[PDB]
Design a protein around this ligand. Structure first.
Ligand code: PC1
Ligand code: PC1
Ligand code: PC1
Lengths: 58, 58
């Protein structure tokens, strides 16, 4: 007979619930990307892609 | 049947709302005021400066 410990049942239930809730992480990420998009653009092209060095002659 | 996918659908509908209510008004507003831009004034000043410079004395 299958007599799992209640520790395991609790762990598996919480694992499933965590899986369910993680699906909204992308949702909130998209919401905060559409919102505050200028901030994301500034971050991307200031830290990950630093500007070029040289300056115009004028 | 996938709640987070339906939330993405709601986000898409809100995006469509924003763009529908945004693009037409902005387009018509910036089409109406095409001749009031700073570029027109700069071009007029450049033309007048050229005309004054070509015709002058020592
Ligand atoms: C260092 C951080 C300090 C500042 C505080 C930061 C708070 C951040 C809050 C926002 C992000 C939350 C993300 C997790 C959300 C989980 C929701 C939930 O209910 O869980 C789903 C399910 C539970 O589903 P549920 O439906 O039963 O949810 C209800 C849960 N209770 C009853 C608690 C209200 O739980 C899980 O299995 C996942 C739990 C994730 C969170 C675990 C926290 C502890 C372990 C990781 C961190 C350890 C270090 C902590 C810092 C110590 C520093 C010395
Ligand atoms: C660089 C950008 C890359 C972007 C790539 C985007 C590509 C997206 C492609 C999606 C294809 C479709 C996938 C469908 C999955 C369905 C799963 C499912 O059944 O869900 C039900 C479950 C919950 O189910 P439920 O309980 O809500 O309902 C089930 C419905 N019935 C009952 C009818 C069956 O949800 C999940 O599985 C959610 C978890 C999986 C997805 C987690 C993704 C996390 C990503 C976090 C953001 C990372 C960003 C990058 C960070 C980089 C940092 C350096
Ligand atoms: C100017 C004054 C007057 C007009 C004000 C304009 C509205 C301002 C507030 C709008 C809030 C959004 C609409 C809520 C309406 C009720 C929806 C509802 O009952 O939920 C069911 C609906 C969906 O339920 P449903 O049952 O209809 O459909 C989904 C069901 N399935 C998947 C089975 C198909 O929920 C939503 O679609 C969105 C819920 C969002 C959470 C509710 C509170 C939002 C509060 C706003 C701020 C949120 C911030 C989040 C980020 C954290 C920031 C710190």
């Amino acid at each position: 007979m299958y007599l799992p410990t209640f520790y395991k049942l609790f762990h598996e239930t919480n694992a499933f619930r965590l899986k369910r809730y993680v699906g909204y992480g992308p949702l909130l990420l998209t919401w905060s990307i559409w919102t505050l998009y200028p901030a994301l653009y500034n971050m991307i092209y200031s830290d990950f892609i630093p500007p070029e060095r040289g300056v115009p002659k004028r | 049947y996938y709640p987070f996918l339906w939330q993405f659908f709601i986000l898409g509908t809100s995006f469509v709302w924003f763009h529908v209510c945004y693009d037409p008004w902005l387009a018509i507003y910036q089409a109406n005021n095409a001749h009031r831009s700073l570029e027109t004034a700069l071009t007029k000043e450049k033309a007048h400066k050229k005309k004054l410079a070509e015709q002058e004395e020592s």
